[PDB]
Symmetry: D2
Subunit: 142 residues, 4 copies
């Protein structure tokens, strides 16, 4: 099994306040599950080769996704911003596989990644535990 535990840090009220609106899990490697404990979010996966996505919406209406998973026994992550209402996590998650237009960032196996949406909201995924089967990452909104 692989697990990825996330801590959500939101740094700038000027960017509004984000909450989770969707949680998906891709079907590879026997799938997996999202759980909550002590204000954190853990994706537990049946093996290497799958992932899950959390979609966030701010109280200002901004939509963004955070994808985390394990590819070839190494953690990966991605952030997609400027999403439209119809571009749900259910749309986004599969795009990382089957030669989708996002598979390339998965193959990068990034232990850290950041991007700034066009509206000026910075997002970052940063693994604090980058090795082994019990991975840990901070998700930082700013």
């Amino acid at each position: 099994t692989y697990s990825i535990t996330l801590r959500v840090f939101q740094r700038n009220p000027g960017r509004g306040f984000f909450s989770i609106v969707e949680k998906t899990v891709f079907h590879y490697a026997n799938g997996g599950t999202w759980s909550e404990a002590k204000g954190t979010h853990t994706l537990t996966m049946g093996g290497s080769g799958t992932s899950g996505v959390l979609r966030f919406m701010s109280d200002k209406g901004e939509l963004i996704t955070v994808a985390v998973g394990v590819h070839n026994y190494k953690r990966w992550c991605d952030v997609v911003t400027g999403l439209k209402p119809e571009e749900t996590a259910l749309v986004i998650n599969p795009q990382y596989y089957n030669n989708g237009p996002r598979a390339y960032t998965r193959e990068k196996q990034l232990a850290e990644y950041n991007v700034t949406s066009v509206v000026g909201t910075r997002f970052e995924v940063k693994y604090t535990v980058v090795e082994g089967n019990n991975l840990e990452a901070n998700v930082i909104f700013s």
Copy 2:
């Protein structure tokens, strides 16, 4: 807009305790978002013709999905039990669309539905508010 607010009732400790492990939203009708308030779960949709799925897992390991949405301005629902690890909600949700294998129960626009898993766990989705754009349903595990 169409919203569906769910109250989860678990009646029989002998069946274990279920918790949400996934929450998807289908991309039709401008998509939508899940939110939580006062222990309830609300699916807010940008119009008629879309849906979302909650996948539950018991602490005994039983996996089931609850689907709710609006089709042609009328609420619909379905429950799938005996799910395998790889049959995530991300897999199940799209199966109701594009003439998928589950599109038939959606077209039924059910205001109530119940079913019992082969392992003996009863599941019921009963709408308490069956009309309008602010729908209410009880999810009952037994």
Copy 3:
């Protein structure tokens, strides 16, 4: 230390739906903390001789408290129903101590307790793990 993990089962929609509105921890035994994990609630205490209270409110307006703790190395529990808005958990919890009017039920060290409110709501606390430092109980609204 001692921990008490609670699973909340709501059995009858006719009685309304309850959500937590308050969580207290008494200051004896070096205090303690409430946490949440996978839909369950755990009270962690620094030792024997303290307790915690969860206050619930139904969407019908009913107010009740669930008290759990460890007295002389044995678990105890109590349920108070028909509470007035001013009778917060902060008021109720201390009443089990210092010769308060509720101390007697703490001293009973009950592994199980049920009561039915004047308005007809049944409540039960039933420990499933009754001994040791890691106690488990079901909380049943009916």
Copy 4:
């Protein structure tokens, strides 16, 4: 009635990650209730003259309380850091009343308050809606 809705912003992963471990409501003004919606926390009170406390614990062991209420029709707030484990919210909340050691900061009716714990963690409560019966504050950990 009065309500105070809180958005929690955690800015610095170096300070650890905080989660709620207790929520109390003082018994004045006919009491009140805590609720959760879309990742925010709302304290609803039966009138002016009461309050409630949120105690947080970081995954680094830091214990702090945030107090918010309404005094003489004006919002107030306070933050206490460096708490011992026996100093539960149940102990701290009443200290703002009956001429307790914290009554003085309640009387200040502050719309903003910040303080840094001896161990280096900055805490701030800043109301964004400072007037009326529907108050809004950001709670910022740094």
